[PDB]
Scaffold this active site. Structure first.
Site, short mmCIF file in Angstrom:
data_model
loop_
_atom_site.label_atom_id
_atom_site.label_comp_id
_atom_site.label_asym_id
_atom_site.label_seq_id
_atom_site.Cartn_x
_atom_site.Cartn_y
_atom_site.Cartn_z
N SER A 1 0.83 -1.19 0.00
CA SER A 1 0.00 0.00 0.00
C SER A 1 0.87 1.24 0.00
CB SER A 1 -0.92 0.02 1.22
OG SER A 1 -0.17 0.16 2.41
N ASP B 1 0.71 -7.75 14.18
CA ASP B 1 1.76 -6.81 13.79
C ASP B 1 1.83 -5.65 14.77
OD1 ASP B 1 3.92 -5.95 12.24
OD2 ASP B 1 2.63 -5.03 10.72
#
Ligand SMILES: Brc1c(Br)c(Br)c2[nH]nnc2c1Br
Length: 327
Positions: free
Chosen positions: A46, A151
């Protein structure tokens, strides 16, 4: 085998549609309502921009998705919609596409983040307690919603230190927890990977996030960021074992019958378990208390089953001063 101590069956108890993200059909709005004003960064998947919604002057963050299997987009979108309104979870405002190219993008609420490298060197004892408590709220929420973030790291915890706002961001690695499911261990940033990932144990759960949380707590109270600074995944486990001990690692492996990659034999060495007080010195002593060390010791454990849950961590006396102020 292994399963989560909390929220183990929560997805099985919900409608299949809740967790069956491959069947999810997002509603894609029009990205032309957004004016990009500044590039904030870029990842494998992204590119992220600060933007303004031209229809209402709202400042937002737009994450434009790079080519990927649609399955991963559906996963992140469904997770974010399931987490709608969750405490301290970044708010997904909309799912949009360029109306011509059909490239998808996610629109999030803006947070005026304070760069963590600067922030972490000025935090007070109370500040650490406060932000850790607020981050725990986000993790307890997502875990309760059957989702592992996978994460957790400083870069994914946006903090506006002026308004005292915290948001857990970057849900593109997050997954739904299902008992006995084997997951990909190629998740989390190196420095925040739990020992289970580093020894290739696939039957992990929400407790992975609690290891990463613990790494963050250690870095904050001790002012060593990242706390376990491996050069690669192998060295990462060595760095952990130099603190938690090698005999203790082997006990963990034996309990879960975990096969250890033999490359580790030449690099782990022999290390005693260290006292957490060994990390105290004049530069961090004002951030460290018996309660902080007791909490940390219960997060940074090899045995994922024995780590505190997010809720148990929030119930720890270390946070009593924060609870008092919020009450
Ligand atoms: Br979502 C989001 C938000 Br909100 C902010 Br603020 C960011 N700053 N850098 N990267 C960011 C991402 Br991704």
């Amino acid at each position: 085998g292994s399963r989560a101590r909390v929220y183990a069956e929560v997805n099985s108890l919900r409608s299949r549609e809740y967790w069956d993200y491959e069947a999810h059909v997002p509603s894609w709005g029009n990205q032309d309502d957004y004016q990009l004003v500044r590039k904030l960064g870029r990842g494998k998947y992204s590119e992220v921009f600060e933007a303004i919604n031209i229809t209402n002057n709202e400042r937002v963050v737009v994450k434009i998705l790079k080519p990927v299997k649609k399955k991963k987009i559906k996963r992140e979108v469904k997770i974010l919609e399931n987490l709608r309104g969750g405490t301290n979870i970044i708010k997904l405002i909309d799912t949009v596409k360029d109306p011509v190219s059909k490239t998808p993008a996610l629109v999030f609420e803006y947070i005026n983040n304070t760069d963590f490298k600067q922030l972490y060197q000025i935090l007070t004892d109370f500040d650490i307690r406060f932000y850790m408590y607020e981050l725990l709220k986000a993790l307890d929420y997502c875990h309760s919603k059957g989702i592992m973030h996978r994460d957790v790291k400083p870069h994914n915890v946006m903090i506006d230190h002026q308004q005292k706002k915290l948001r857990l961001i970057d849900w593109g690695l997050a997954e739904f927890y299902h008992p006995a499911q084997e997951y990909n261990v190629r998740v989390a940033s190196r420095y925040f990977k739990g020992p289970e990932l580093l020894v290739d144990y696939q039957m992990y759960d929400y407790s992975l996030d609690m290891w990463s949380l613990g790494c963050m707590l250690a870095s904050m109270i001790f002012r060593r960021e990242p706390f376990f600074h491996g050069q690669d995944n192998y060295d990462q486990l060595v760095r952990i074992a130099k603190v938690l001990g090698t005999e203790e690692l082997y006990g963990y492996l034996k309990k879960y019958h975990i096969d250890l990659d033999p490359h580790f034999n030449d690099i782990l060495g022999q290390h005693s378990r260290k006292r957490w007080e060994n990390f105290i010195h004049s530069e961090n002593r004002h951030l460290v208390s018996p309660e902080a060390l007791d909490l940390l010791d219960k997060l940074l454990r090899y045995d994922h089953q024995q780590r505190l849950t997010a809720k148990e961590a929030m119930e720890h006396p270390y946070f009593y001063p924060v609870v008092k102020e919020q009450s």
